[PDB]
Amino acid sequence: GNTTSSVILTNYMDTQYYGEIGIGTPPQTFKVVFDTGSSNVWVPSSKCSRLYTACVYHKLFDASDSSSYKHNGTELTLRYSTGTVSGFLSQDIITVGGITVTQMFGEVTEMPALPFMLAEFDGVVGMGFIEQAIGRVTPIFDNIISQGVLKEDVFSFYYNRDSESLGGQIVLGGSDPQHYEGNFHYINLIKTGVWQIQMKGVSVGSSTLLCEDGCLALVDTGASYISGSTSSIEKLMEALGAKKRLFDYVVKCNEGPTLPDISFHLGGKEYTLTSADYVFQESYSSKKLCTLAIHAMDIPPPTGPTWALGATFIRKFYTEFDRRNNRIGFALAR
Amino acid sequence: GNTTSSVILTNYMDTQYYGEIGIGTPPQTFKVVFDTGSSNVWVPSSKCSRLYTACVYHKLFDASDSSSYKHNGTELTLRYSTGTVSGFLSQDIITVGGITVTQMFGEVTEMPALPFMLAEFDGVVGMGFIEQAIGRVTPIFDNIISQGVLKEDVFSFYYNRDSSLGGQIVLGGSDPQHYEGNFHYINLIKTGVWQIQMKGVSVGSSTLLCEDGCLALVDTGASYISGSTSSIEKLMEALGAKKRLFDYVVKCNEGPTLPDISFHLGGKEYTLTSADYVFQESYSSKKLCTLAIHAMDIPPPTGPTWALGATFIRKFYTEFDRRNNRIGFALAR
Ligand SMILES: C[C@@H](c1ccccc1)N(CC(=O)N(C)C)C(=O)C[C@@H](Cc1csc(N)n1)C(=O)N[C@@H](CC1CCCCC1)[C@@H](O)[C@@H]1CC(C)(C)N(C)C1=O
Ligand SMILES: C[C@@H](c1ccccc1)N(CC(=O)N(C)C)C(=O)C[C@@H](Cc1csc(N)n1)C(=O)N[C@@H](CC1CCCCC1)[C@@H](O)[C@@H]1CC(C)(C)N(C)C1=O
């Protein structure tokens, strides 16, 4: 076909990038997160216990105000690495920047405070294959593709950096030659079903101080940070001088602007992040500490163990999620 | 051609703005400073001596690492206003934005603490004309032009106030996201150098400095605006700034109090307020804030000149027009 669409994204702190979707007629608008580590949608439910503060604090979907709605009803649990969310399935029309799909989605009626209370977005839009969908429900894009609108069978990520800007943007169908420079480098996934890519190594410094003899890289938009297995990060951090705490990694602020280059030996290229890319310099004091933008995560099999290239890296490199030919391409951005 | 290549820039303390470049095959990455005041490209040699604490903390070029690398060994001393550096000439491919070109880069081997240590980046990329070149080696832009890939033979500069995005260079034109209105150019007095002529420095209402013509280098790799010791001396008096052990400070609390400083360029006035000159770390009556202007005596031939640095560039988006050999300005955003 010939459709191209955007979805304008709001960059909230370099940690959260959400768009907006509408469900039901009249539309009920929601701040969702576009997530290539999942294949499901879900948005708070009217039916949700108000004893769930997140449910007091977000926008709930009320089906009784949706003439376009078809009760389904199956319980589903969406457990993500940072938190779980049980609910049940409904169906209605979703409007995703341009495209209308009768989406099969889920009414979250148990929304935990941790993390959700710190969430700026209401729900999530999974952009991973059906080979991961809980309940085996045909995923949003999978529906846009069965629609024959799309000029091209790809979706691309642009993640801006903050402003005191244009936050980011997805493009369903195409790519945006005003977000990148040069040309793409294509890496083609291992199995289909997961956005993974083989990684030939990780160089903090110059020396491949990690992933020598390869490892795997999952490409995910729903990840604020870069993640690497526990020991993998233990070592990286070690190299790097970083203080391991509870949730994040730290560094004397002043220390920041000199932390060495870290590189991803990806599909043959070397994808380097300099410390201006992984260091949240909110200062240069010897007294204040500074939060890196990399952090462990042990991902259990079957997907894991993997490195997860989140928001951190998509911010430096435009990413082309290519369904047709089944591969992912990156470009340097603008 | 029809390309255009931005290079995102880091801003270390509103004083240093540096981007990345990659040399050789495979590309090897360094942090550089794109200098309109210089015309040689140089980065540390791996051949650089450990005793130089400097090379010690700075990215180095292992030529063994580049397949494309080509030998030249012709010795090079580069001598800047705040330092002299020195090594020999090499030849590889350079990446700049999505652009890639073979260059005559210098591979540094004698590099001092002062200033070298100050530096957060590793090298320099001189956006100067050939004319002002050591070894008379064609400057980087000089090649790229010839590559015939870029739409316009111009490069823009956006310096950002620090608090993000700290700057960005446009090789091939301008990023209209970063300027307000249109440019008002200013012809080069003459090729070779990036210097226009100023018709007067104002303190509020009146010209005081530069009553009958002066020079102004618009320079990207100089932090502060500079004047001759003797004009700046006059300048700090109208202000009531005081030299303090090093440079001129103010009682922060009195920032808001100071007269706008005005650069008469090509008929129009380029006007900087306190907001833009003082580094108001605070608004304390208890603190001294420092100004972002310095006395800096440039030698003949290029001197005496005023020199608009990052201070001024922060305000006025700069357009370096190779083609017309003019310099255009516009309000950054
Ligand atoms: C803590 C969590 C969070 C908190 C509040 C609000 C929003 C998000 N964060 C922010 C965060 O990590 N920092 C450091 C602030 C995530 O990025 C969440 C990210 C954690 C992570 C895992 S690997 C990595 N690099 N980061 C994740 O779970 N991301 C989920 C989807 C989330 C989208 C936003 C709503 C919550 C679910 C799947 O991408 C991950 C990836 C995959 C497939 C391995 N897997 C099974 C998952 O569950
Ligand atoms: C210390 C020096 C520096 C150098 C290296 C690293 C860190 C800092 N600094 C910061 C500085 O002086 N303050 C006060 C922040 C410069 O701005 C440097 C600037 C000083 C200057 C001269 S006129 C003026 N207003 N400011 C300069 O010498 N700039 C050089 C090239 C430098 C680029 C960064 C690496 C060190 C060399 C040419 O632009 C100048 C311009 C000209 C024409 C005077 N000439 C011959 C030069 O060599």
What secondary structure letter does DSSP report for A294? B
Closest CA to A78 of A118, A46, A33: A33
Cβ atoms B279, B191 nearer than 8 A? no
**Terminal C-alpha separation, chain A:** 28
Residue list, ligand 2 pocket, CB within 6 Å? B 15, 33, 35, 37-38, 80-83, 115, 118-119, 124, 217, 219, 221-224, 226, 294, 296, 298, 302, 307, 309
Cβ atoms B29, B18 nearer than 8 A? no
The CA–CA distances, whole Å, from A233 to A137, A221, B317 equal 35, 20, 41
Q: Which of A159, A206, A208 to mutate to test the interface with B (most CBs of B within 10 A)?
A: A206
Do strands A28-35 and B206-209 pair parallel, antiparallel, or not at all (unpaired)? unpaired
Q: How far apart are CA A257 and CA B10, in angstroms?
A: 10
The CA–CA distances, whole Å, from B24 to A202, A268, B66, B98, B109 equal 20, 15, 5, 14, 18
CATH of domain B4-174: 2.40.70.10
Cβ atoms B112, B99 nearer than 8 A? no
Pocket test for ligand 2, best of B82, B220, B225 (most atoms within 8 A of CB): B82
**Angle subtended at Cα A72 by Cα A68 and Cα A78, rounded to the nearest 5 degrees:** 110
Task: Specify which residues B62 forms β-bridges with.
Answer: none
Residues 6+ apart with CB under 8 A from A28: A22, A59, A61, A62, A65, A66
Cβ atoms B42, B78 nearer than 8 A? yes
Instruction: Please indicate whether residue A115, judged by its CB atom, sits closer than 6 Å to ligand 1.
Output: yes
Nearest C-alpha to atom 4 of ligand 1 is from which residue? A115
Partner residue opposite B164 with nearest CB, options A162, A181, A270: A162
The CA–CA distances, whole Å, from B70 to A72, A79, A114, B144 equal 69, 55, 57, 19
For residue B64, the tally of other CB atoms under 10 A from its CB is: 8
Q: How far apart are CA B105 and CA B110, in angstroms?
A: 15
Q: Which residue has the tokens 């950002």?
A: B160
Task: For A167-191, give one letter per residue: b (16+ CB within 10 A) or e.
Answer: bbbbbbbbbbeebbbbebbebebee
Tokens of A219: 């490409």
Residues 6+ apart with CB under 8 A from B219: B35, B36, B37, B194, B307, B308, B309
Cβ atoms B108, B48 nearer than 8 A? yes
Q: Is B35 a catalytic residue?
A: yes
Cβ atoms A256, A284 nearer than 8 A? yes
Cβ atoms B263, B216 nearer than 8 A? yes
Give the per-residue SS3 of B122-135.
Answer: CEEEECCCCCCCCC
What secondary structure letter does DSSP report for B91? B
Collapsing DSSP states into helix, strand and coil, what is residue B260?
A: coil
**Residue ranges matching CATH 2.40.70.10 in chain A:** 4-175, 176-333
Which residue type, as a one-letter code, is found at position A131? E
For residue B152, the tally of other CB atoms under 10 A from its CB is: 18
Instruction: Please indicate whether residue A10, judged by its CB atom, sits closer than 6 Å to ligand 1.
Output: no
CATH of domain A176-333: 2.40.70.10
Cβ atoms B181, B330 nearer than 8 A? yes
Task: Specify which residues A226 forms β-bridges with.
Answer: A294, A309
What secondary structure letter does DSSP report for B259? P
Closest CA to B327 of B270, B268, B266, B276: B266
Does A163 contact B164 at a Cβ distance shorter than 8 Å?
yes
- Phi/psi for B235 (5° steps) reads -55, -45
Task: Specify which residues B187 forms β-bridges with.
Answer: B326
Ligand nearest to the CA of B15: 2
Collapsing DSSP states into helix, strand and coil, what is residue A225?
A: coil
**Angle subtended at Cα B18 by Cα B331 and Cα B247, rounded to the nearest 5 degrees:** 75
Sign of the Cα pseudo-torsion (A267, B31, B279, B263, in order): negative
**From which experimental method does this structure derive?**
X-ray
Does B120 contact A257 at a Cβ distance shorter than 8 Å?
yes
**Angle subtended at Cα B9 by Cα B5 and Cα B14, rounded to the nearest 5 degrees:** 145
Cβ atoms B12, B174 nearer than 8 A? no
- Phi/psi for A229 (5° steps) reads -50, 160
Nearest C-alpha to atom 11 of ligand 1 is from which residue? A224
Which residue type, as a one-letter code, is found at position A258? T
Closest CA to B107 of B142, B58, B34: B58
If phi > 0 it is left, if psi is from -120 to 50 it is alpha, else beta; for residue B236 that is: alpha
Sign of the Cα pseudo-torsion (A9, A12, A17, A18, in order): negative
Partner residue opposite A161 with nearest CB, options B26, B29, B165: B165
Q: How far apart are CA A181 and CA A175, in angstroms?
A: 12
The CA–CA distances, whole Å, from A265 to A120, A125, B68, B125 equal 33, 29, 20, 27
Q: How far apart are CA B169 and CA B172, in angstroms?
A: 9
Closest CA to B177 of B326, B10, B330, B288: B330
Question: In angstroms, what is the resolution?
Answer: 2.8
Q: How far apart are CA A114 and CA A117, in angstroms?
A: 6
What secondary structure letter does DSSP report for B177? T
Q: How far apart are CA A52 and CA B232, in angstroms?
A: 64
> Is B212 buried (19+), middle (13-18) or exposed (0-12) by CB count in 10 A?
exposed
Does A272 contact B29 at a Cβ distance shorter than 8 Å?
yes
- Partners of A283 on chain B (C-beta within 8 Å) are none
**Residue ranges matching CATH 2.40.70.10 in chain B:** 4-174, 175-332
Q: How far apart are CA A171 and CA A173, in angstroms?
A: 6
CATH of domain B175-332: 2.40.70.10
Does A257 contact B29 at a Cβ distance shorter than 8 Å?
no
Q: Would you state the torsion angle of the CA atoms of residues A105, A107, A110, A116, taken in this order, to the nearest 10 degrees?
A: 70
Q: Which of A184, A261, A277, A283 to mutate to test the interface with B (most CBs of B within 10 A)?
A: A261
Question: How many C-alpha atoms does B180 have within 13 Å on its Cβ side?
Answer: 5
Nearest C-alpha to atom 40 of ligand 1 is from which residue? A37
Q: How far apart are CA B96 and CA B6, in angstroms?
A: 8
Helix segments in B120-190, DSSP class H: 140-147
Q: What is the DSSP string of A82-151?
A: TEEEEEEEEEEEEEETTEEEEEEEEEE-B--HHHHTT-SSSEEEE-S-TTS-GGG---HHHHHHTTT-BS
If phi > 0 it is left, if psi is from -120 to 50 it is alpha, else beta; for residue A257 that is: alpha
Could you confirm whether domain A4-175 is CATH 2.40.70.10? yes
Residues 6+ apart with CB under 8 A from A213: none
**Angle subtended at Cα B17 by Cα B15 and Cα B23, rounded to the nearest 5 degrees:** 145
Tokens of B175: 């990023």
Collapsing DSSP states into helix, strand and coil, what is residue B228?
A: coil
- Phi/psi for A264 (5° steps) reads -100, 105
> Is B267 buried (19+), middle (13-18) or exposed (0-12) by CB count in 10 A?
exposed
What secondary structure letter does DSSP report for A239? H
